[PDB]
Design an enzyme around this catalytic site. Structure first.
Site, PDB file in Angstrom:
ATOM      1  N   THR A 229     -22.756  -0.077 -35.482  1.00 51.41           N
ATOM      2  CA  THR A 229     -21.999   0.160 -36.704  1.00 51.41           C
ATOM      3  C   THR A 229     -20.996   1.293 -36.558  1.00 51.41           C
ATOM      4  OG1 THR A 229     -22.222   0.402 -39.102  1.00 51.41           O
ATOM      5  CG2 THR A 229     -23.577   1.833 -37.714  1.00 51.41           C
ATOM      6  N   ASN A 230     -21.197   2.193 -35.595  1.00 50.81           N
ATOM      7  CA  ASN A 230     -20.231   3.260 -35.367  1.00 50.81           C
ATOM      8  C   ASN A 230     -18.905   2.701 -34.865  1.00 50.81           C
ATOM      9  OD1 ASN A 230     -22.179   5.570 -35.831  1.00 50.81           O
ATOM     10  ND2 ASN A 230     -23.185   4.566 -34.092  1.00 50.81           N
ATOM     11  N   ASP A 231     -18.933   1.505 -34.277  1.00 50.06           N
ATOM     12  CA  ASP A 231     -17.754   0.950 -33.627  1.00 50.06           C
ATOM     13  C   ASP A 231     -16.890   0.106 -34.556  1.00 50.06           C
ATOM     14  OD1 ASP A 231     -18.893   1.823 -30.933  1.00 50.06           O
ATOM     15  OD2 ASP A 231     -20.379   0.325 -31.540  1.00 50.06           O
TER      16      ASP A 231
ATOM     17  N   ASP B 274     -18.415   0.787 -24.507  1.00 51.75           N
ATOM     18  CA  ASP B 274     -19.484   1.633 -25.021  1.00 51.75           C
ATOM     19  C   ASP B 274     -20.764   1.343 -24.251  1.00 51.75           C
ATOM     20  OD1 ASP B 274     -20.659   3.516 -26.976  1.00 51.75           O
ATOM     21  OD2 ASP B 274     -21.747   1.741 -27.673  1.00 51.75           O
TER      22      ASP B 274
ATOM     23  N   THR C 220     -23.832   2.410 -25.078  1.00 51.37           N
ATOM     24  CA  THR C 220     -24.937   2.210 -26.002  1.00 51.37           C
ATOM     25  C   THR C 220     -24.957   0.757 -26.447  1.00 51.37           C
ATOM     26  OG1 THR C 220     -23.734   2.654 -28.048  1.00 51.37           O
ATOM     27  CG2 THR C 220     -24.538   4.544 -26.799  1.00 51.37           C
TER      28      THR C 220
ATOM     29  N   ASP D  28     -23.701   9.596 -26.335  1.00 52.13           N
ATOM     30  CA  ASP D  28     -24.868  10.295 -25.813  1.00 52.13           C
ATOM     31  C   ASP D  28     -24.443  11.525 -25.011  1.00 52.13           C
ATOM     32  OD1 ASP D  28     -26.984   8.433 -26.763  1.00 52.13           O
ATOM     33  OD2 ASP D  28     -25.972   7.032 -25.415  1.00 52.13           O
TER      34      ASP D  28
END
Length: 1016
Positions: free
Chosen positions: A749-751, A416, A418, A632
């Site tokens: 937290t998305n991961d 990732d 980000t 993104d």
């Protein structure tokens, strides 16, 4: 052990089938996790005349729904009730019914059960392998080999006690993370009472607040009223604290969902409270004495998230279990050769009528027990432990050891950008869209409307110390804005002569809406009237349609801004006219977005980390594939990917779902020159021609249309963009289904959901320790922001896998040599006395221990460790080496037997014990040579691990063994070999013994190395 439990349960009392009155009920563990257990039912009187039989398993309560479902079900929690009803809910009213409810629905005890070291030892002693080992030890006892028995039993109990000790050391840490019970100010019987944490039950109303002792939140609670600054680090791990909003503002028609509404309204357990904002006295409702935020208890016991994770930690595994099929087949093959040796033993012995039969069967069983090495799973555990300890020094923790070995087999790695491949702190270059052309103007020259839009639109918070904490994007924009943020939610400019803006209430970001809004009012100049102005921000593509007036070059300027790779975020501000105080509360969150006015973009530069380039280059050099999964702009991800050489083709084409339904999807290149609709054939040719990347919306469209072509296309895609957290789980699981071992590195937290299901997962925590939601149950956990953890963990996985292969090969050869030697050579009346096979046991133990502690190299290499033991190389090399050694052993035996004088008397007195011989000498020296040769030949050096000389312990051990062999063969000291009871050999035939030994060693080396060269 587990099966051994149910026999005792059957013996104690009969199993009972009739549901009228069951004394005991067996618990099915289910294959996922757990253990077989028996629990006694609880009989309770029914106030309404209805009885329920209850039991507790893993401190989880389940009930037999005798009314409707007629089956065992877990107790329903109050979370399932309506959100609007809980808004109208007042709570309990009397204390007698409070104990009634507590007794009938149970209680919650955050304290855990730590087994005693003696109890742990007793429970581990039930394992099948220790029973098999102690049986074998008793058999060596029965064969008079008393010293052998005592040494082997001592070593086995010592290693088992070491495992128990390290288990207890781990349990001490779990005790350390335990939260001490404490008093809490809770609402009960229309009153507020001082109540300890343990006696909280769901349905209670608790007014939590900033504890002067910094006490952690006891359990999950639903924030009824008020705002609060909550530091969810130790649970969630986000360095940015998450805001909490009151539910009294929430609509009653809403139905609460844990997955959707977790971040902003439900206060998780185990967190630390920093600051609580008290509600206005005008509002009528729950009045707390402590003036803390009132909250409703949803989940308790160990069914809470923290309780679930830590209980899964406790009763998941005591120690890692690796009794896989490979170990079973290894035992089976060694046992096959064991049974062959034993059959020859029995046949040759039965050819002799004089000798006892029962004794002969005793040494037969002795051979069988010796074959299965008593140290087999011991060194597998040792290698895993050594790997874990080595990996510990790189400041990276491992919650679960078991998928450490899986790290070597990795082929595709997910990343990732980000926060993981790019620093989140970054910097803002300027504000774009406020001047003609694509040029970005400095923050100094942007209009005051842009100033207030940027300043107001922020979810940042002020602590008791007042330190500015929040999203680094918002942090950086407000730093560029430079307006002071006060604790009273008032934004004051440092150097601008404008009235401050006070944010009345904040609407936070929603994943589905891809937007957030800020509602506030500013005082008009020269008047006391309050004019409400709202500033919003979100996805520019979504924000475009919501603009009432928009320049024609919106998408154009957006495209060129995203071309540079800087994060672009559209800024909006609506006049909204004049608004009243009540109407501000009246307006819903989805109403501010309509009739917006364009204000401009902001360019947010993402600085690619320099350390990323080298590690990416190295991992591509490792015959591995790298895939990018991020959220993104897709072409922004393309710029990042090409910068790190994630894509090296001449061009890359983006995929879009078509505007019109029924239209075939068509790719478009980054420059747009190449456009081609998707073909039903394999995309291999296109992938060779050019790189392919998939968008999240296109991902959803392909999921909805047909999964087949999506499954075919995923493996050859390098870049994944605009992917919401559920679709990251989708892509990780899809990659797993193709069979490739999946590695993912995520921070946000998305991961969490994706790192849950990955084959090997690492979570990175910025600054610091946060110990995020993933990091509690992620496979691995790293504390360094750099992604060198990826290469380090891959290297350690390679090392541990190659060490396991090495270990299995060594044990196979050494067990076969010792087994066959002893088996046939006892047949020839030639058995090892105590001292000599005690010596060999010491040499095996020391050499195994030293080789278990191998060290890895510094850099990885292009070659790949073997997938597992089940490959032709291992079996063919073990058999070739075994025959090469067997021929030598047979030659030595026949050559010696052609020499020793025969028996003087056919009948030998039974009372006579062992008396020394020469065949003893030759067989023992040859066996020692064979172990030395095994260790020297089978040690695979570079480039998977260090060279043979570098491992000083193994070099020293092999040198000592060789010195012992040479000294015994020379027999220089009569006292030495007399102590071993070895008869002198004539020098004229140490000549032949040495020559054949060297011949055997050299043939083994040449055969193994030529096999490696041919089948490399």
């Amino acid at each position: 052990g587990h099966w051994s439990v149910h026999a005792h349960c059957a013996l104690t009392c009969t199993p009972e089938y009739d549901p009228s009155k069951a004394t005991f009920v067996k618990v099915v563990p289910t294959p996922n996790n757990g253990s077989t257990e028996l629990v006694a039912l609880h009989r309770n009187e029914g106030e309404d005349g209805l009885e329920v039989l209850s039991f507790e398993f893993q401190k989880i309560k389940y009930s037999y729904d005798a009314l409707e479902k007629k089956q065992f079900l877990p107790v329903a929690f109050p979370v399932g009730n309506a959100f609007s009803y809980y808004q109208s809910n007042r709570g309990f009213q009397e204390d007698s019914e409070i104990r009634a409810a507590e007794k009938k629905f149970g209680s919650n005890k955050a304290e855990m059960v730590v087994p005693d070291f003696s109890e742990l030892f007793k429970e581990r002693a039930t394992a099948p392998f220790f029973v098999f080992q102690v049986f074998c030890v008793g058999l060596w006892c029965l064969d008079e080999y008393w010293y052998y028995s005592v040494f082997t039993l001592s070593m086995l109990v010592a290693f088992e006690a070491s495992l128990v000790q390290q288990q207890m050391r781990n349990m001490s840490e779990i005790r350390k993370m335990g939260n001490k019970p404490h008093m809490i100010q809770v609402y009960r019987s229309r009153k507020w009472r001082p109540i300890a944490s343990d006696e909280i039950v769901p349905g209670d109303i608790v007014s939590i607040g900033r504890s002067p002792q910094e006490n952690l939140v006891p359990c999950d609670v639903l924030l009824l009223r008020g705002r609060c600054i909550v530091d969810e680090a130790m649970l969630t791990g986000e360095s940015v604290p998450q805001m909490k909003e009151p539910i009294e503002d929430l609509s009653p028609d809403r139905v609460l969902d844990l997955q959707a509404d977790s971040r902003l309204h439900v206060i998780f357990g185990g967190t630390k409270v920093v600051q609580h904002i008290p509600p206005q006295k005008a509002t009528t409702g729950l009045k707390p004495v402590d003036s803390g935020c009132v909250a409703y208890v949803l989940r308790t016991g160990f069914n809470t998230s923290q309780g679930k994770l830590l209980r899964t930690i406790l009763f998941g595994v005591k120690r890692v279990t690796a009794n896989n099929l490979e170990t079973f087949i290894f035992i089976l093959f060694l046992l096959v050769f064991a049974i062959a040796a034993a059959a020859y033993v029995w046949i040759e012995g039965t050819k002799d009528p004089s000798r006892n039969r029962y004794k002969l069967f005793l040494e037969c069983t002795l051979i069988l027990t010796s074959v299965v090495p008593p140290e087999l799973p011991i060194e597998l555990s040792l290698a895993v432990n050594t790997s874990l300890i080595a990996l510990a020094k790189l400041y990276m923790y491992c919650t679960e050891p078991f998928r450490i070995p899986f790290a070597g087999k990795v082929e595709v790695c997910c990343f990732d950008k980000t926060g993981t491949l790019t620093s989140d702190s970054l910097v803002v270059r300027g504000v774009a869209g406020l001047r003609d052309g694509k040029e970005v103007t400095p923050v100094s020259s942007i209009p005051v409307e842009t100033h207030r839009a940027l300043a107001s639109c922020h979810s940042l918070m002020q602590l008791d110390d007042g330190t500015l904490v929040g999203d680094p994007l918002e942090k950086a924009m407000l730093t560029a804005v430079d307006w002071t943020l006060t604790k009273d939610e008032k934004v004051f400019p440092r150097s601008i002569k404008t009235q401050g803006l006070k944010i009345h209430q904040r609407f936070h970001f929603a994943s589905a809406l891809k937007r957030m809004s800020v509602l506030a009012s500013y005082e008009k100049l020269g008047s006391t009237d309050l004019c409400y102005i709202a500033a919003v921000k979100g996805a520019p593509e979504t924000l475009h349609s919501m603009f009432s007036q928009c320049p024609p070059d919106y998408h154009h300027i957006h495209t060129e801004i995203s071309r540079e790779g800087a994060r672009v975020l559209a800024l909006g501000y609506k006049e909204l006219g004049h608004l009243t105080h009540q109407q501000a509360r009246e307006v819903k969150r989805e109403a501010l977005e309509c009739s917006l006015k364009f204000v401009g973009f902001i360019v947010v530069s993402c600085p690619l980390k320099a350390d990323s380039k080298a590690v990416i280059r190295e991992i591509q050099n490792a015959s591995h594939r790298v895939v990018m999964i991020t959220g993104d702009n897709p072409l922004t991800a393309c710029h990042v990917a090409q910068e790190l050489h994630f894509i090296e083709k001449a061009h890359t084409l983006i995929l879009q779902p078509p505007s019109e339904k029924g239209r075939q999807c068509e790719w478009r290149s980054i420059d747009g020159s190449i456009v081609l609709p998707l073909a039903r054939g394999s995309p291999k040719a296109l992938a060779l021609e050019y790189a392919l990347c998939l968008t999240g919306d296109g991902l959803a469209h392909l999921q909805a249309t047909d999964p087949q072509q999506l499954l075919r296309l995923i493996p050859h895609v390098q870049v994944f963009a605009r992917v919401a957290p559920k679709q990251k789980e989708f892509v990780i699981t899809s990659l797993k289904e193709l069979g490739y071992v999946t590695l993912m590195c995520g921070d946000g937290t998305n991961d969490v959901g994706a790192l849950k299901h990955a084959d090997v997962g690492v979570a990175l925590l910025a600054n610091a320790v946060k110990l995020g939601d993933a990091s509690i149950a992620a496979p691995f956990t790293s504390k360094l922001s750099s992604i060198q953890c990826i290469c380090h963990v891959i290297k350690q996985g390679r090392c541990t896998l190659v060490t396991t292969l090495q270990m299995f090969k060594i044990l196979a050869l050494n067990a076969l040599i010792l087994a066959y030697s002893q088996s046939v050579l006892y047949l020839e009346g030639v058995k090892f006395s105590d001292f000599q096979a005690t010596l060999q046991g010491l040499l095996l133990a020391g050499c195994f221990l030293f080789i278990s502690r191998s060290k890895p190299l510094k850099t990885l290499s292009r070659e790949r460790p073997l997938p597992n033991i089940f490959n032709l190389y291992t079996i063919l090399t073990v058999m070739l080496q075994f025959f090469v050694h067997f021929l030598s052993l047979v030659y030595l035996y026949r050559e010696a037997q052609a020499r020793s004088p025969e028996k003087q008397e056919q009948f030998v007195d039974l009372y006579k014990e062992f008396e020394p011989s020469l065949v003893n000498s030759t067989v023992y020296i040859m066996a020692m040579a064979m172990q030395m040769a095994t260790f020297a030949i089978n040690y695979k050096g570079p480039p998977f691990m260090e060279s043979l000389p570098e491992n000083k312990p193994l070099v020293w051990s092999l040198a000592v063994s060789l010195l012992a062999i040479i000294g015994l063969l020379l027999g220089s000291s009569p006292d030495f070999n007399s102590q071993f009871g070895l008869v002198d050999i004539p020098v004229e035939f140490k000549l032949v013994i040495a020559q054949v030994l060297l011949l055997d060693f050299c043939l083994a080396l040449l055969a193994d190395r030529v096999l490696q060269f041919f089948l490399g």
